[PDB]
Design a protein around this motif. Structure first.
Motif, PDB file in Angstrom:
ATOM      1  N   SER A  26       0.939  -1.168  -0.070  1.00 64.03           N
ATOM      2  CA  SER A  26       0.031  -0.070  -0.022  1.00 64.03           C
ATOM      3  C   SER A  26       0.974   1.405  -0.177  1.00 64.03           C
ATOM      4  CB  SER A  26      -0.943   0.042   1.266  1.00 64.03           C
ATOM      5  OG  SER A  26      -1.796  -1.238   1.139  1.00 64.03           O
ATOM      6  N   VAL A  27       2.051   1.231  -0.817  1.00 64.65           N
ATOM      7  CA  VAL A  27       2.648   2.214  -0.579  1.00 64.65           C
ATOM      8  C   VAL A  27       2.987   2.971  -2.163  1.00 64.65           C
ATOM      9  CG1 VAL A  27       4.157   1.790   1.283  1.00 64.65           C
ATOM     10  CG2 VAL A  27       5.109   1.262  -1.054  1.00 64.65           C
ATOM     11  N   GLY A  28       2.139   2.393  -3.029  1.00 63.99           N
ATOM     12  CA  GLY A  28       2.108   2.825  -4.600  1.00 63.99           C
ATOM     13  C   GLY A  28       1.628   4.014  -4.895  1.00 63.99           C
ATOM     14  N   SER A  29       0.883   4.793  -4.087  1.00 57.65           N
ATOM     15  CA  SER A  29       0.155   5.992  -4.369  1.00 57.65           C
ATOM     16  C   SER A  29       0.221   7.010  -3.087  1.00 57.65           C
ATOM     17  CB  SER A  29      -1.109   5.685  -4.645  1.00 57.65           C
ATOM     18  OG  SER A  29      -2.028   6.823  -4.771  1.00 57.65           O
ATOM     19  N   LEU A  30       1.517   7.396  -2.800  1.00 56.19           N
ATOM     20  CA  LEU A  30       1.620   8.340  -1.506  1.00 56.19           C
ATOM     21  C   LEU A  30       1.731   9.818  -2.160  1.00 56.19           C
ATOM     22  CD1 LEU A  30       4.272   6.235   0.174  1.00 56.19           C
ATOM     23  CD2 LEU A  30       1.939   6.328   1.159  1.00 56.19           C
ATOM     24  N   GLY A  31       1.045  10.666  -1.461  1.00 51.86           N
ATOM     25  CA  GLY A  31       1.083  12.034  -1.623  1.00 51.86           C
ATOM     26  C   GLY A  31       1.938  12.886  -0.496  1.00 51.86           C
ATOM     27  N   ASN A  32       1.954  14.085  -0.945  1.00 50.65           N
ATOM     28  CA  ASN A  32       2.532  14.974   0.221  1.00 50.65           C
ATOM     29  C   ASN A  32       2.326  16.556   0.039  1.00 50.65           C
ATOM     30  OD1 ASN A  32       4.260  15.707  -2.103  1.00 50.65           O
ATOM     31  ND2 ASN A  32       6.025  15.755  -1.046  1.00 50.65           N
ATOM     32  N   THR A  33       1.236  16.941  -0.771  1.00 59.07           N
ATOM     33  CA  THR A  33       0.976  18.075  -1.010  1.00 59.07           C
ATOM     34  C   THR A  33      -0.057  18.804   0.136  1.00 59.07           C
ATOM     35  OG1 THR A  33       0.367  19.353  -2.880  1.00 59.07           O
ATOM     36  CG2 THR A  33      -1.136  17.989  -2.262  1.00 59.07           C
ATOM     37  N   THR A  34      -0.563  17.900   0.980  1.00 62.32           N
ATOM     38  CA  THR A  34      -1.265  18.609   2.143  1.00 62.32           C
ATOM     39  C   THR A  34      -0.998  17.794   3.173  1.00 62.32           C
ATOM     40  OG1 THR A  34      -3.404  19.065   0.463  1.00 62.32           O
ATOM     41  CG2 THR A  34      -3.959  18.409   2.540  1.00 62.32           C
ATOM     42  N   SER A  35      -1.545  18.556   4.253  1.00 61.86           N
ATOM     43  CA  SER A  35      -1.231  18.042   5.645  1.00 61.86           C
ATOM     44  C   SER A  35      -1.770  16.457   5.871  1.00 61.86           C
ATOM     45  CB  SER A  35      -1.723  19.076   6.745  1.00 61.86           C
ATOM     46  OG  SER A  35      -1.558  18.602   8.034  1.00 61.86           O
ATOM     47  N   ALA A  36      -3.014  16.265   5.609  1.00 61.82           N
ATOM     48  CA  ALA A  36      -3.639  15.070   5.839  1.00 61.82           C
ATOM     49  C   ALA A  36      -2.746  13.985   4.826  1.00 61.82           C
ATOM     50  CB  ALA A  36      -5.119  15.167   5.624  1.00 61.82           C
ATOM     51  N   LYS A  80       1.630   6.863   8.051  1.00 63.26           N
ATOM     52  CA  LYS A  80       1.016   5.721   8.609  1.00 63.26           C
ATOM     53  C   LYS A  80       1.160   4.662   7.900  1.00 63.26           C
ATOM     54  CE  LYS A  80      -2.755   8.549  10.636  1.00 63.26           C
ATOM     55  NZ  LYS A  80      -3.646   9.700  10.118  1.00 63.26           N
ATOM     56  N   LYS A  81       1.226   4.765   6.716  1.00 63.72           N
ATOM     57  CA  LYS A  81       1.335   3.620   5.733  1.00 63.72           C
ATOM     58  C   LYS A  81       2.845   3.192   5.437  1.00 63.72           C
ATOM     59  CE  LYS A  81      -1.735   5.409   2.267  1.00 63.72           C
ATOM     60  NZ  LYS A  81      -2.402   5.231   1.110  1.00 63.72           N
ATOM     61  N   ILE A  82       3.615   4.119   5.538  1.00 65.67           N
ATOM     62  CA  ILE A  82       5.130   3.787   5.527  1.00 65.67           C
ATOM     63  C   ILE A  82       5.426   2.850   6.685  1.00 65.67           C
ATOM     64  CG2 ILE A  82       7.469   4.338   5.473  1.00 65.67           C
ATOM     65  CD1 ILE A  82       6.485   6.813   3.948  1.00 65.67           C
ATOM     66  N   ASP A  83       5.176   3.333   7.939  1.00 63.22           N
ATOM     67  CA  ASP A  83       5.274   2.562   9.176  1.00 63.22           C
ATOM     68  C   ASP A  83       4.545   1.155   9.253  1.00 63.22           C
ATOM     69  OD1 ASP A  83       5.517   5.544  10.876  1.00 63.22           O
ATOM     70  OD2 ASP A  83       7.023   4.241  10.758  1.00 63.22           O
ATOM     71  N   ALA A  84       3.263   0.990   8.469  1.00 68.58           N
ATOM     72  CA  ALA A  84       2.776  -0.172   8.465  1.00 68.58           C
ATOM     73  C   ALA A  84       3.508  -1.095   7.576  1.00 68.58           C
ATOM     74  CB  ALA A  84       1.335  -0.108   8.220  1.00 68.58           C
ATOM     75  N   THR A 139       4.916  -5.034   8.372  1.00 63.85           N
ATOM     76  CA  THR A 139       4.879  -6.243   7.644  1.00 63.85           C
ATOM     77  C   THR A 139       6.078  -6.792   7.171  1.00 63.85           C
ATOM     78  OG1 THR A 139       4.405  -5.862   5.236  1.00 63.85           O
ATOM     79  CG2 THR A 139       2.748  -5.032   6.995  1.00 63.85           C
ATOM     80  N   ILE A 140       7.078  -6.061   6.876  1.00 58.01           N
ATOM     81  CA  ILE A 140       8.107  -6.741   6.191  1.00 58.01           C
ATOM     82  C   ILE A 140       8.910  -7.300   7.378  1.00 58.01           C
ATOM     83  CG2 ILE A 140      10.511  -6.273   5.152  1.00 58.01           C
ATOM     84  CD1 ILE A 140       9.242  -4.249   3.387  1.00 58.01           C
ATOM     85  N   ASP A 141       9.215  -6.744   8.601  1.00 59.20           N
ATOM     86  CA  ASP A 141       9.412  -7.246   9.766  1.00 59.20           C
ATOM     87  C   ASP A 141       9.186  -8.764  10.145  1.00 59.20           C
ATOM     88  OD1 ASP A 141      11.173  -4.972   9.842  1.00 59.20           O
ATOM     89  OD2 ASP A 141       9.734  -4.105  11.665  1.00 59.20           O
ATOM     90  N   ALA A 142       7.585  -8.628   9.956  1.00 59.72           N
ATOM     91  CA  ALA A 142       6.981 -10.197  10.417  1.00 59.72           C
ATOM     92  C   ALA A 142       7.282 -11.161   9.348  1.00 59.72           C
ATOM     93  CB  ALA A 142       5.424  -9.849  10.488  1.00 59.72           C
ATOM     94  N   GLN A 143       7.546 -10.909   8.093  1.00 57.51           N
ATOM     95  CA  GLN A 143       7.948 -11.846   7.118  1.00 57.51           C
ATOM     96  C   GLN A 143       9.212 -12.309   7.503  1.00 57.51           C
ATOM     97  OE1 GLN A 143       6.355 -12.670   3.350  1.00 57.51           O
ATOM     98  NE2 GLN A 143       6.260 -10.364   2.907  1.00 57.51           N
TER      99      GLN A 143
END
Lengths: 54, 54
Positions: free
Chosen positions: A7-17, A24-28, A32-36
Motif C-alpha cells: 500500500s505504498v504505491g500512491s503516496l502524496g505529500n501536497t497536503t497535511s492530511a 502511517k502507511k510507511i510505518d505499517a 509487515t516486512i519485519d514479520a515476514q
C-alpha cells in the motif's frame, strides 16, 4: 511484497492530511516486512537443527 | 552352547544399536529446549511490545 500489496504505491505529500496518511502507511509497511523476515528466520533455524539430527 | 553364544552376541549388538539411535535423537531435543528457555527469559523485558512478543 511489492508496492501494491504494501500500500505504498500512491503516496502524496501536497497536503497535511496526505502527509499524515503517508507516514502511517510507511510505518505499517515496515512492520509487515519485519514479520515476514521473522518467519523466514525461524524456518532457517528449524532446518539447521533438522539437518544436524539427520 | 557355542552356537547359541554366537547368536546371542549378535542380538546384544542389535540392542546396542537401538539404544544408540534413540539416545542420539534425544540430544537435539535437549538443544532446542535450551533455545526455548533463552527465548522465554528474553520475553521478560519491560521494553518489549506485542510485536516483539509475537
Amino acid at each position: 511484497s511489492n508496492k501494491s500489496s504494501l500500500s505504498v504505491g500512491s503516496l502524496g505529500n501536497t497536503t497535511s492530511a496526505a502527509r499524515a496518511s503517508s507516514l502511517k502507511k510507511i510505518d505499517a509497511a515496515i512492520k509487515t516486512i519485519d514479520a515476514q523476515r521473522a518467519d523466514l528466520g525461524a524456518i532457517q533455524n528449524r532446518l539447521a537443527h533438522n539437518i544436524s539430527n539427520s | 552352547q557355542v552356537r547359541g553364544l554366537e547368536v546371542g552376541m549378535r542380538n546384544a549388538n542389535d540392542a546396542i544399536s537401538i539404544a544408540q539411535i534413540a539416545e542420539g535423537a534425544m540430544q537435539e531435543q535437549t538443544n532446542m529446549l535450551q533455545r526455548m528457555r533463552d527465548l522465554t527469559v528474553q520475553s521478560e523485558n519491560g521494553a518489549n511490545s506485542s510485536a516483539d512478543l509475537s
